[PDB]
């Protein structure tokens, strides 16, 4: 018989299977559509989620009650030291799909990226790319041949970049290597832009600008095996239920004589790849810039780092991106920031954002001071004498 009361389904059948992602670095599965007219540029960037803080800003939204009034907003800080371009890939179009034709690497690779090619770096003799580095023996004629092949063929060109993980407060030491598509200019122009940027660094302000809407691609926080009450959000069974109430009561009808693929069942929660879109960049901060956290309305001499540092992460010494709201992934997690796939004219986008104040109180408790000077000015002299 019928259900007797309609209720929408629990969960989303388009986020299946709820399995662990194949890698800790979620892959960019679609790049912005190329425009040959614009100058050659990167389509995404790599970074590490540091943590969240709070801002206050004036809201510019005519017709809303809070027009020209101050709003408190949560933001997420991503530590984005400049990436290093080390390689270029050529992709040819085939009836079976886009196929890699060849890769060309830079003459010199750093240790933090060479570590990526080893499982046991300390035991190794570190022979990686030693014979490849000999292709630049006389004039790099092999490199020129491969670049010529990429120019002749290869409708799509991507550059291999690696993070500068040594500039982050992380214990990892092993940089993350990723392919980032080049948008703009002809194929030869893209190949050149890779060739004169081998072993050079690319700053985040050359890829992203203020107020821009971007996408965050990251693997979410892991939670291990979860039951259906929290993995799928089903109703808890009554208190009187024999043999357990954190379950689905009926996992199927007698016919079909099987458990459906669409019935909620316990298993792995979290550690899923997620592409979240339409996050507004509130600040592109610079590492070589004291007073990152100072604004026009503030001029309070302070960086972006909270008192005691970002909890479980550390301190921001490099360039950073401030995105409104939250993004998938936890602190210290590698996150890829991608340019918007379409043009957004919703007037929630394309609205210039001017920060008035950035919160730098301690997140390790109920922080009540923004700077040590403020704390000392409030509390006076303590027994601990500096």
């Amino acid at each position: 018989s019928h259900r007797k009361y309609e209720a929408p389904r629990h969960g989303h059948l388009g986020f299946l299977p709820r399995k662990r992602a194949a890698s800790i670095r979620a892959r960019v599965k679609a790049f912005p559509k190329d425009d040959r007219s614009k100058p050659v540029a990167l389509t995404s960037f790599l970074g590490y989620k540091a943590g969240m803080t709070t801002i206050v800003r004036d809201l510019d939204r005519p017709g809303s009650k809070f027009h020209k009034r101050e709003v408190v907003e949560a933001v997420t800080v991503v530590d984005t030291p400049p990436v290093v371009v080390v390689g270029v890939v050529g992709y040819v179009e085939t009836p079976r799909g886009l196929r890699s034709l060849t890769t060309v690497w830079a003459e010199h690779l750093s240790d933090e990226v060479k570590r990526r090619f080893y499982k046991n770096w300390y035991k190794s003799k570190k022979k990686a790319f030693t014979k490849y580095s000999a292709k630049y023996a006389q004039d790099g004629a092999g490199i020129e041949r491969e670049l010529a092949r990429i120019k002749k063929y290869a409708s799509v060109v991507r550059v291999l970049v690696h993070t500068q993980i040594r500039k982050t407060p992380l214990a990892q030491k092993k940089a993350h290597l990723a392919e980032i598509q080049l948008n703009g200019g002809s194929i030869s122009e893209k190949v050149d832009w890779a060739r004169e940027h081998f072993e050079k660094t690319v700053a985040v302000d050359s890829v992203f600008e203020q107020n821009e809407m971007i996408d965050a691609i990251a693997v979410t926080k892991g939670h291990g095996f979860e039951g259906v009450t929290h993995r799928w959000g089903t109703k808890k069974l009554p208190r009187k239920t024999h043999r357990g109430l954190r379950k689905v009561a009926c996992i199927g009808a007698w016919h079909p004589a099987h458990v459906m693929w669409s019935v909620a069942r316990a298993g792995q929660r979290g550690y899923h790849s997620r592409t979240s879109i339409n996050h507004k960049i509130y600040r592109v901060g610079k590492g070589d810039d004291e007073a990152n956290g100072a604004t026009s309305f503030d001029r309070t001499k302070k960086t972006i780092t909270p008192m005691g540092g970002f909890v479980h992460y550390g301190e921001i010494k490099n360039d950073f991106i401030m995105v409104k709201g939250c993004i998938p992934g936890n602190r210290k997690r590698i996150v890829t920031l991608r340019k918007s796939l379409y043009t957004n004219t919703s007037r929630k986008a394309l609205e210039e954002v001017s920060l008035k104040w950035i919160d730098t109180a301690s997140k390790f408790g109920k922080g009540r001071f923004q700077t040590p000077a403020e704390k000392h000015a409030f509390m006076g002299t303590l027994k601990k004498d500096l």
């Binding site: 206050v56 008035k356 109920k366």
Partner: protein
């Protein structure tokens, strides 16, 4: 962007921090955290709580 003052402890309140409580006689109390809110709800005297601004003012500490 006004820095408010805790009605129990005298702590400075930055935007989004703590709570605001409207009493039945429409008197407004601001609290920087649930500690000040809880002691106020417990009807503790701020003048008898050693770490508050009223206490240090009354006992002339750090002046």
């Amino acid at each position: 962007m006004k820095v408010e003052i805790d009605s129990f402890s005298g702590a400075k309140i930055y935007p989004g921090r703590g709570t605001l409580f409207v009493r039945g006689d429409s008197k407004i109390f601001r609290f920087q955290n649930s500690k000040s809110a809880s002691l106020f709800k417990q009807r503790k005297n701020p003048r008898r709580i050693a770490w508050t601004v009223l206490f240090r003012k009354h006992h002339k500490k750090g002046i």
